Amino acid sequence: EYNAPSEIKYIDVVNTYDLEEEASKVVPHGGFNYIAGASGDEWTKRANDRAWKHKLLYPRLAQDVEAPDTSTEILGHKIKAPFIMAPIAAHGLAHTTKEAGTARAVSEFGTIMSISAYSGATFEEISEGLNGGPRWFQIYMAKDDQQNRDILDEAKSDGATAIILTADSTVSGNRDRDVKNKFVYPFGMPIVQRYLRGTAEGMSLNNIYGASKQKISPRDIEEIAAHSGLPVFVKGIQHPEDADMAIKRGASGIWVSNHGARQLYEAPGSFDTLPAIAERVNKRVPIVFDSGVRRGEHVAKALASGADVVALGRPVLFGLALGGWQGAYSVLDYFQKDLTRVMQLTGSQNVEDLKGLDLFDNPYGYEY
Template structure:
């Protein structure tokens, strides 16, 4: 799968790693990603277990079998069968392991507290990604936008901050950049575009976000992204 995705485009690609219970499997995944030409590893740290996804239960959603790059191949497509695969503890040693085994820059994704951000950086992370997994992992956890300013202050530009979860409009991008993010990630809007119109749908979503962002920048008096970062939100 790594090679198939890598061959689909010439742009830079990052591999998102869900750390497994078996380090042998983790090494194999990292080796395959590196061999396929991936330029960075995104270590997801907020998925040591599956969340209570009630929408999936209502919609009778099941995963196709087998699950793929996981220790447990699952039974019946139940998402909670994935819990047998996920590493139950992810800490500084985990970050160091991925850096050592991959030899690539590692972005730690799923950060929602300043202490965890600083821990990831001390372990060698090249960037952190503030994310609550689109709100699907732990219901009631704080919105990423709520915790962004405190994390940005703690990091003090030691490494870049990628920000996601809840971005729906260009104005959301502006607010995130003004609050300390360096890069803004989109998830659900891109999936919506893909479902409705394939790659053209995805392109349409990105173009709309950019159009809205340009509009907000004009109205806010920001000519560049760096100007946005100096904006004050009230």
């Protein structure tokens, strides 16, 4: 069986990169490699990281007297800082309290929880941690329309206030850890098993992964947007034409992502794709950005480049490994404090001022 860490404690987060190596000491090797790894030789995961050096922050004089305020609003919900939790499968690979632990951290901090369809936790377990906090539900597009009806009803029943339609799947990702390590999940998918039980699709992990279309179309977006009764974010957008087609099909948001470099290999770093998408979106729908956010400076650069919020992923799971909900809360607190420092140095009093930053174009890239 699977020996996840179970300790609950606050952690002194000085930077999020060191959390990866610290988590590698407490997370079983197979689970750790599932979380940390990425496609191919991880060049596009490194590109996610290095892309932040392509656009650099300028320190700027202040024009306002007040203390910085990190709060913002998305879909009418006020959140403590311009970051949400990304949808991540199987939080139990990092900690025994699993998605309930992360939900407690996110709800206590004051932002939005994204629930993966591949949660290892029941919604009842997650609800305990959420304690009324806002939540969005991430889904894959099922080949069988009934399964889409089923998960949209599950999301409405669970008080979701948005759907995140992930554009890519059947556990994709040429060379993270399943072709190499030969590691398979130690637990189930109770959210989808609720509705797949007694169908062929529920019989195995392969059948669950295989129940999804491998890539969505604009027609798929239109069907989910028409029947969800909720705003739909399309997640995995890296090209501006796709953003335009998704909005025309009825998307209520664009979630710019390469899923933490877990799918297509030898693709751009996600941040390099953001400005072209934001210019084409041109204010029509909110933008969520993710894939590689590690520092407060990254949150600021994403806002300056057209994101309304960013989503956080691996660093929150590494925090959860190291301290359960308190460890995940420490990571959210780190980002909020670091963002406040960046606001002070850029002369920004609020999140709107961050959206107005001028960035320095660095044509030399990472080695400068």
